[PDB]
Amino acid sequence: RSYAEQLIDTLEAQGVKRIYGLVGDSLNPIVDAVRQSGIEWVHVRNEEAAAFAAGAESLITGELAVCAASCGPGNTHLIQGLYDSHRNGAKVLAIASHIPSAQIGSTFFQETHPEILFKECSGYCEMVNGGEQGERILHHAIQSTMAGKGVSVVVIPGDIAKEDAGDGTYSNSTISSGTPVVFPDPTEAAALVEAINNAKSVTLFCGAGVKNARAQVLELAEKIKSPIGHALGGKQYIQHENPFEVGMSGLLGYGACVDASNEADLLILLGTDFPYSDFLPKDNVAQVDINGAHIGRRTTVKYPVTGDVAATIENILPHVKEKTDRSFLDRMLKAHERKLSSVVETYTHNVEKHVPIHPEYVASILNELADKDAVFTVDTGMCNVWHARYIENPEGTRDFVGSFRHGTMANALPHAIGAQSVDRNRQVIAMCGDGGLGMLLGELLTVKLHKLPLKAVVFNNSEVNFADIAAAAGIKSVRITDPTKVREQLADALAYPGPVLIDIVTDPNALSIPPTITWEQVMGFSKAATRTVFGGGVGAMIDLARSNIRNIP
Amino acid sequence: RSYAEQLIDTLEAQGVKRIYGLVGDSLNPIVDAVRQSGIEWVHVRNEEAAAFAAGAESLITGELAVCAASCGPGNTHLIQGLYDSHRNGAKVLAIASHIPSAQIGSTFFQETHPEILFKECSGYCEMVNGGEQGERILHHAIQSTMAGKGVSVVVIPGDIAKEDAGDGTYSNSTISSGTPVVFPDPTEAAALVEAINNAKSVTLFCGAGVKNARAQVLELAEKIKSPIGHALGGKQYIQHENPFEVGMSGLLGYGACVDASNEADLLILLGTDFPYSDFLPKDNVAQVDINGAHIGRRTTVKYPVTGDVAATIENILPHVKEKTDRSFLDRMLKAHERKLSSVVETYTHNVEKHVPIHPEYVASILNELADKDAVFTVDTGMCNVWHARYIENPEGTRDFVGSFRHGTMANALPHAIGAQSVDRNRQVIAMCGDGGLGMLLGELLTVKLHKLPLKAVVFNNSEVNFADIAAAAGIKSVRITDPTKVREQLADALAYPGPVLIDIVTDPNALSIPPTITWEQVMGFSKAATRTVFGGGVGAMIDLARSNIRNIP
Amino acid sequence: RSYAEQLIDTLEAQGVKRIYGLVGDSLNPIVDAVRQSGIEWVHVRNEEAAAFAAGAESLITGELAVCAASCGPGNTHLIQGLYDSHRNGAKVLAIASHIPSAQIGSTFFQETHPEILFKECSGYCEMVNGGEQGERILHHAIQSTMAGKGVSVVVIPGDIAKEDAGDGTYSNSTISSGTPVVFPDPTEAAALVEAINNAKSVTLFCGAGVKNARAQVLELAEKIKSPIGHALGGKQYIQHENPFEVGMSGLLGYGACVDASNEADLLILLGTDFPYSDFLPKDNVAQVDINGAHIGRRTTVKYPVTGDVAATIENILPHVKEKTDRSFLDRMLKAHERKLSSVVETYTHNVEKHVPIHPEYVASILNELADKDAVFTVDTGMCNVWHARYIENPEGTRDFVGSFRHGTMANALPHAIGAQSVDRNRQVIAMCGDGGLGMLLGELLTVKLHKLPLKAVVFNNSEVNFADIAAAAGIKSVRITDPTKVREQLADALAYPGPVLIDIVTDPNALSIPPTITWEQVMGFSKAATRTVFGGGVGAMIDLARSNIRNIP
Ligand SMILES: Cc1cc2nc3c(=O)[nH]c(=O)nc-3n(C[C@H](O)[C@H](O)[C@H](O)COP(=O)(O)OP(=O)(O)OC[C@H]3O[C@@H](n4cnc5c(N)ncnc54)[C@H](O)[C@@H]3O)c2cc1C
Ligand SMILES: Cc1cc2nc3c(=O)[nH]c(=O)nc-3n(C[C@H](O)[C@H](O)[C@H](O)COP(=O)(O)OP(=O)(O)OC[C@H]3O[C@@H](n4cnc5c(N)ncnc54)[C@H](O)[C@@H]3O)c2cc1C
Ligand SMILES: Cc1cc2nc3c(=O)[nH]c(=O)nc-3n(C[C@H](O)[C@H](O)[C@H](O)COP(=O)(O)OP(=O)(O)OC[C@H]3O[C@@H](n4cnc5c(N)ncnc54)[C@H](O)[C@@H]3O)c2cc1C
């Protein structure tokens, strides 16, 4: 058998179910092996979508996901989605098909040196030079991404896919995909205990690193009476049913999070790399991170701790003294609810009758009507504001995929294609901005071909009729222009048993920016301390804020 | 004044009229300086289009063209178009806006290291670290691309655009954009004279390097009675009104070019880097190239000559003896016309009544109806076959832009946006494949915004209604399904004074591939000598073939 | 036969006589093929020396020179010498032996990715992946460096050297190594003519680009009565027998060059990339360079010309008007001789009796005693000052090799090993600094092994006895401590028919630095205009200065 056959057999034995990619001639031997296997080829019409779809699938499943591209220009289109996947921590293998080995170094038709292009967006990237070495580096690529070291790329000269397979020595191996339990160094954990016991008031600020530490964070918060704020990456895990909830920091922020973080005697950063330093205090900060290289990237950290959040809290809890004074927690919960109530009153008074349709009204209804376990994908831009302030996660059963770190546009539909491919019976909603729809046609043609029943909600601030474009491409569509019809039309679109594009004509003057917000602040290089956020209201998060006030002892 | 103001003033003083790009927040100071200048910002809705549009503009004008992108993901979208522009020899400066200098090295939001990504697709790529150094490297970037050394990239941390301008020392300089006259080394030129005088029969094979050498190539051919064949890059310059015409080599080839090249006593490669070595002889070859590093890249070369084609022929002509025997030239001209007549008879007999519409019928009519000075842009894929075999260049007044070397898909509309922006009164036709239309929407929205009257001819082998999609995006469209209506409907679409999308439903089974053509041959790594080309007919080129037979003495 | 045999046969057929390198196990197949060939392996004891020796050989012969290194750490030692060779324009091929192809991508023992390390110090660098492709990229590497495009590197996985040779298609080719004749663009040449005719006074400032243009530069100078100054790279070609000589600019400078350059109505930079902009005027400058990308790198250039210096002067001379007024030339020649006489009087009055020995006294005697056709190699540091101010080139028959652009230390003995290997009957003098002798032992052991009769002149400012070290390593040595014995002892050492190390105890307080020279000026980032040079005298150059005054009409 050939190396193309061995590559596909190896992926199949490891549980890979799909490969995303646009087929080109250099991939033909690999596509032929996939056709004879149990793996499904997912044909993306835009080559740039393949790596976002694989990234989104891996984020949903926790398992390896795979994308592929043809030689030269083909694998150049992997770069954006691989930066996004790599920064998001998605476990992706990219099969970068390459020119024939005989043409390397001759400035051949389509020739590139793909190893140079993926150096920053991967943990492992090597070229195959034969079947035996190709089997070996395929193992190393999978083992590197499954051990959490980043995206992996295997560059395969087209002709070598047809050469003989290796002998099986590396494909026979079991991949380590376990989660080690990382306890902190006792000296660092003792310094954190002392910092907490010496502080009269503590605030916890959580990011994506608290994903598997909800119970420990909440147990710690109840013991020391600490308000809990979050970065955007931690919103989905820690905001829901949180008795200590004080919102989010940054320009898309809300509530008393910036106040609680800067007024507490001690701030504890838990599993976060929140980059907007002008919102963070410097006086007295602790930071717990599983990657020690991340500690102190964003502000002065006096109590650094390398370790897992859950294992670190479990280790310090018997030595942390109970704080009976919750004056600070009560003050912050009250200020939090007043801040949310104030932005609702200032910006969304009688928003249900606003014409053209207010996007915040759409987001509020969308939060109510979407399924309790829906996946939301979020296009970079204004949709990040609507997700942050209106899309909630009751009981933690929704999933959220976006380009929160790499910040690239037009990611929602490619992410949704991967997320929807995991389970066709699960609802997937893609929040799309009209500006991020220049590549819409290829995304719709992929959705139509694979019958992926995702719901593309377009915040149309153009005038372009996206409902007519979707209908011409063979996709069911609806156009919403009257605010009194949003609930009815959205409920009917979300109930459609198939792919739908929902074209909602929204008000282009929605983004409210206070006169004090500068270009330096927007760009993230303003030094002066700030508590200023973009204008606009908030949604259903106010219900938890209000129950937390009623439950104050 | 600021460095952003100085950058725009410098480009404006050098004759730059447009900057192509998608505006993002990191570019705001530069966009503000453009607004107050005589330069027009051309807003591309797909960021990937900017570098193709600049590349196409530079190929048409011969002058500097400029594209720009916002930080991180933004300048990652420049890569495809910059590889294409760099390989095509287009003189492009890319303004790669970058994250704030204070965040470099902190894994900030959107952070990339753009210097690593452009190393292979540029001749110069440096980062600005202040206003004074920024003025200097802007000069060096422009001087490098104007001297023919490749694409140039200037990476500008967003905050530095607002810092003070340099003192003018480098912006005050005159750029050398001249064309030196490169005569060959007399020893190399003497060896070429001897090779020609010792050969009884000679064939010339021309590429893009004969652009300014038509008269010299034809004068040499008449003196030694040599058939003249071409690579695809040389078709536009040497095929028209050529009394020695014997067609093109490679799988998209036609006529007796492969026979004449391999049967002549001496083959002279003139200004070509044709990469399909299995079509080239090895026994006795000369090669003239202005870049000595390119000589002998593709086959055995015994008579290498570094120099300009026109200056080299002028230098050797007084020493080359007149060949009175034209038996070989006559045999090749006769075989050439029989080969063209044979493929017309085999593949396009009664093609005017073929249903669904034959793409070769569309291409033939398009060649007749398009203006004598039209620009054609060619989408990579089947449109390369139709351009090569049907779109002619009478009197050399048409221009052709495609991704002939980098071979990336979806280039036709981005190339056409740049070409059309040069002169709105000049016809621009974009030959689009239905597979290369996943990014169509953003291209149409740019064309609509700037009122660019290009004609997008879509070879629709899908069923998708692209005419309805174009009409929904606010673009005039027509749908052609009946072959007897192609001439009338195409003539009316080409006459429309504005942008039009022409959706032509064509036969998806057009590509004829002989059973002997292997995947190795398609991929370009088959070693065995070949004369086999893809099936299909040829167009109006047969008229010149037939006049050349009538003019045989 | 094997690819190792084919590589050596190919180099041998192209006239390669030596390969410099330290043999390691990964090179064994290549070393075995060299042993059975006419090529000599030159064993360098310090692997870092190999690339400097090849660079020096190529500078002396004008032909390809070759170095080799073993895998991993071995080819890492090529980098310094390859930056030096690449910047000096030496035509070098480096054979970078690499780990076995089966281990690539496995973090094997000694594994590196050598392609990344040579990107800036080469014009071509590719990896061999088989015998056929290896033959092809060997051709491309040689053709790139012989066409003047920079150093070339061929990376060869150790095991592939034992695989079968390619079929000969590329090794059968003739390499283009000719010198094209580059005439300027007539528009640029016309602007240069106008600038010269409108100026009342002109100064020419020449660099290494005037190597083959002495007669044209001197003919132009006589016609327009222009003083001729030089950068250090042009000293060896234009200073000797020059009736217009006005010295050198920069901190190591001398004479009226800075004055003549800044006081003339027009400055013409001819074949120079002199980097110390604070010594250059900005008001009215022309620049002629064969590489257009270099034009205007260093100051404002209003009259840029891309072209060869000799061809450009030949083209403009019939249109340049004769200037009969030589008031400026006479004033500059007089000021030049007064400046040289003044530094001799200020710094070297009675230097023949100075104790410890003055290095300027050593340099003056060395200039007199060395052969008329000697090669001088110059260690970076104080030896650059002594070469610049004391080592002359009567009739142009001496050669000079140094690290003038890359500026790396300890280059003199590795450069001298390559230069001496070209012709054992030609005198080679290496000017060594005591600080640049930490790697002396390996250099002496190579010189002893190959019986290279070079003369290592050590300016010993330590106390270390280098004569005793050389004697212990088996090399003839002499120690000079008395200034009255320098002439006699140096004459006897230079006459020794074999390698000699001459240990001269010199005064460590020789470097005179005026109180106005700042660290910014030493580092090359001071903006203010300057005419200040380091203290110290000059040598035999004063004889030409004085004859030029006597010959003033
Ligand atoms: C248009 C736009 C606007 C934005 N505006 C904002 C804004 O106003 N506010 C905002 O908050 N964000 C904003 N973001 C996103 C922002 O740039 C950051 O990506 C985000 O704040 C980071 O969230 P995080 O810290 O949860 O995740 P990450 O940056 O991924 O950090 C997670 C950290 O947890 C660590 N970790 C992982 N697992 C564990 C574990 N088991 N134990 C311990 N540590 C662990 C990781 O090593 C890492 O350091 C914006 C994004 C976009 C696209
Ligand atoms: C789908 C597809 C299929 C293709 N199939 C074919 C095919 O079958 N046949 C085919 O021919 N092409 C084919 N091509 C294109 C092919 O890959 C090459 O790009 C093309 O053949 C190169 O043309 P060229 O030699 O004219 O241009 P280039 O490769 O650009 O070479 C031009 C040469 O001229 C030299 N030069 C420039 N100016 C001068 C001067 N003044 N004097 C001297 N030398 C000078 C340059 O240094 C260079 O070496 C295909 C492309 C695509 C997208
Ligand atoms: C310790 C130290 C101190 C130094 N101090 C000084 C100092 O004070 N003064 C000084 O002058 N140097 C000094 N140097 C060297 C300095 O850094 C430069 O390397 C040197 O001045 C450059 O000389 P150049 O212009 O002749 O050569 P290059 O920089 O090599 O420039 C040659 C130019 O000629 C062009 N060219 C080549 N062939 C042709 C042709 N046929 N026609 C046209 N153009 C052609 C090339 O493209 C190039 O642009 C120092 C070096 C060291 C190690």
Distances (CA, A) of A58 to A86, A146, A377, A420, C260: 11, 11, 14, 12, 70
- Among B64, B230, B253, CA closest to B152: B64
CA of A274 to the centre of ligand 1 (A): 5
Q: Do C106 and A130 touch (CB under 8 A)?
A: no
CB neighbour class for B485 (10 Å; exposed up to 12, middle 13-18, buried from 19): exposed
DSSP C369-382: HS-TT-EEEE-SSH
Q: Is C126 on the interface with A (CB under 8 A)?
A: yes
Q: CA-CA distance, B7 to A549, in Å (whole number)?
A: 56
**Any idea how long chain C is?**
553
Contact, B192 vs B303, CB < 8 A? yes
The token pair that represents A414 in the structure block = 């490619």
Closest partner residue to A439 (CB to CB) among B83, B110, B438 is B438
Q: CA-CA distance, B13 to B285, in Å (whole number)?
A: 47
Contact, C5 vs C167, CB < 8 A? no
Distances (CA, A) of A74 to A79, A127, B80, C143: 10, 16, 10, 30
DSSP B188-237: HHHHHHHHHHH-SSEEEEE-GGGTT-HHHHHHHHHHHT--EEE-HHHHHH
Contact, C345 vs C327, CB < 8 A? no
Burial B4-17 (b: 16+ CB within 10 A, else e): bbbbbbbbeebebb
Q: CA-CA distance, C495 to C479, in Å (whole number)?
A: 15
Q: Do C307 and B180 touch (CB under 8 A)?
A: yes
Q: Pairing state of beta strands B181-183 and C181-183?
A: antiparallel
**Any idea how long chain B is?**
553
Alpha helix stretches (DSSP H) within A207-358: 214-224, 232-238, 257-263, 309-316, 327-347
Q: CA-CA distance, A343 to B24, in Å (whole number)?
A: 28
Contact, C157 vs C111, CB < 8 A? no
φ and ψ at C412, to 5 degrees? Answer: -60, -45
If one residue of C83, C149, C232, C270 were mutated to test the ligand 3 pocket, choosing by the most ligand atoms within 8 A of its CB, it would be C232
Element containing residue C328 per DSSP (H, E): helix C327-347
Q: Do A133 and C157 touch (CB under 8 A)?
A: no
φ and ψ at C41, to 5 degrees? Answer: -85, 125
CB neighbour class for A252 (10 Å; exposed up to 12, middle 13-18, buried from 19): middle
3-state secondary structure of C432: strand
How many helices (H) and strands (E) are present in chain A, helices listed first? Answer: 21, 18
Burial C220-233 (b: 16+ CB within 10 A, else e): bbebbbbbbbbbbb
DSSP A263-274: HSSEEEEES---
Q: CA-CA distance, C538 to C385, in Å (whole number)?
A: 10
Contact, B268 vs B251, CB < 8 A? no
φ and ψ at A396, to 5 degrees? Answer: 70, 15
Q: Which residue has the tokens 């931690």?
A: A234
Enumerate residues 157 to 186 of chain C having a beta carbon within 8 A of any beta carbon in chain B. 169-170, 172-176, 178-185
Q: Is C32 on the interface with A (CB under 8 A)?
A: no
3-state secondary structure of A317: helix
Give bridge partners of residue B428 from the DSSP assignment: B375
Distances (CA, A) of A234 to A209, A396, B68, C190: 7, 12, 34, 68
Q: CA-CA distance, A22 to A47, in Å (whole number)?
A: 5
CA of A493 to the centre of ligand 1 (A): 32
- Among B232, B277, B545, B242, CA closest to B385: B232
CA distance C275 to chain B (A): 13
In degrees, to the nearest 5, what angle opens at C-alpha A263 toward C-alphas A260 and A268? 65
Start-to-end C-alpha separation, chain B: 71
In degrees, to the nearest 5, what angle opens at C-alpha C113 toward C-alphas C110 and C116? 140
SS (H, E, C) C125-186: EEECCCHHHHHHHHHHHHHHHHCCCCCEEEEEEHHHHHCECCCCCCCCCCCCCCCCEEECCH
Q: CA-CA distance, C506 to A53, in Å (whole number)?
A: 72
State the CB neighbour count (10 A cutoff) for residue C177. Answer: 23
- Among B194, B96, B87, CA closest to B141: B96
The token pair that represents B334 in the structure block = 């006769």
DSSP state letter for A506:
B
Alpha helix stretches (DSSP H) within B321-380: 327-347, 359-369
Give bridge partners of residue A519 from the DSSP assignment: none
Q: Give the residue from chain B lying closest to C138, CA to CA.
A: B297
CA distance A396 to chain B (A): 26
The resolution in angstroms reads 1.5
Q: CA-CA distance, A238 to A205, in Å (whole number)?
A: 10
Distances (CA, A) of A47 to A85, B120, B405: 15, 21, 19
3-state secondary structure of A27: helix
Chain C CB contacts of A129 below 8 Å:
101, 104, 129, 157
Q: CA-CA distance, B503 to B464, in Å (whole number)?
A: 10
Distances (CA, A) of B239 to B218, B312, B392, C154: 11, 21, 8, 39
3-state secondary structure of A505: strand
B541 labeled binding residue? no
CA of C207 to the centre of ligand 3 (A): 6
Q: Give the residue from chain B lying closest to C307, CA to CA.
A: B180
- Among B502, B542, B456, B493, CA closest to B357: B502
Query: Which one of the ligands is nearest to C213 CA?
Result: 3
- Among A21, A15, A102, CA closest to A61: A15
- Indicate which atom in ligand 1 lies nearest the CA of residue A206: 26
**Any idea how long chain A is?**
553
Which are the contacts of C467, defined by CB distance < 8 A and separation ≥ 6? C477, C478, C479, C501, C502, C503
φ and ψ at C154, to 5 degrees? Answer: -115, 115
Query: Sign of dihedral through CA atoms A369, A375, A377, A382?
Result: positive
DSSP B266-315: EEEEES-----GGGS--SSEEEEESSGGGTTSSS--SEEEES-HHHHHHH
Element containing residue A197 per DSSP (H, E): helix A186-198
CA of C245 to the centre of ligand 3 (A): 18
Contact, A463 vs A488, CB < 8 A? no
Contact, A416 vs A450, CB < 8 A? no
Query: Sign of dihedral through CA atoms A356, A360, A365, A370?
Result: positive
Contact, B438 vs A441, CB < 8 A? yes
Chain A CB contacts of B442 below 8 Å:
437-439
Furthest-apart CA atoms within chain B: distance in Å: 76
In degrees, to the nearest 5, what angle opens at C-alpha A267 toward C-alphas A264 and A273? 145
Start-to-end C-alpha separation, chain A: 71
Distances (CA, A) of B422 to B14, B17, B400, C503: 16, 9, 14, 70
Q: Is B69 in the pocket of ligand 2 (CB under 6 A)?
A: no
Residue nearest to atom 25 of ligand 1 (CA): A272
Element containing residue C343 per DSSP (H, E): helix C327-347
Q: CA-CA distance, C270 to C224, in Å (whole number)?
A: 15
CB neighbour class for A397 (10 Å; exposed up to 12, middle 13-18, buried from 19): exposed
φ and ψ at B2, to 5 degrees? Answer: -90, 165
DSSP B63-92: S-EEEEE-TTHHHHTTHHHHHHHHHHT--E
Q: CA-CA distance, B5 to B158, in Å (whole number)?
A: 13
Per-state percent for chain B, helix, strand, coil, to nearest 5: 45, 15, 40
Give bridge partners of residue B286 from the DSSP assignment: B268, B303
Furthest-apart CA atoms within chain C: distance in Å: 76
Alpha helix stretches (DSSP H) within A199-299: 214-224, 232-238, 257-263
Contact, A90 vs A61, CB < 8 A? no
Element containing residue B139 per DSSP (H, E): helix B131-146
Q: Is A127 on the interface with C (CB under 8 A)?
A: yes
How many helices (H) and strands (E) are present in chain C, helices listed first? Answer: 21, 19
The token pair that represents A297 in the structure block = 């990237």
Q: CA-CA distance, B36 to C195, in Å (whole number)?
A: 35
The token pair that represents C180 in the structure block = 């094209």
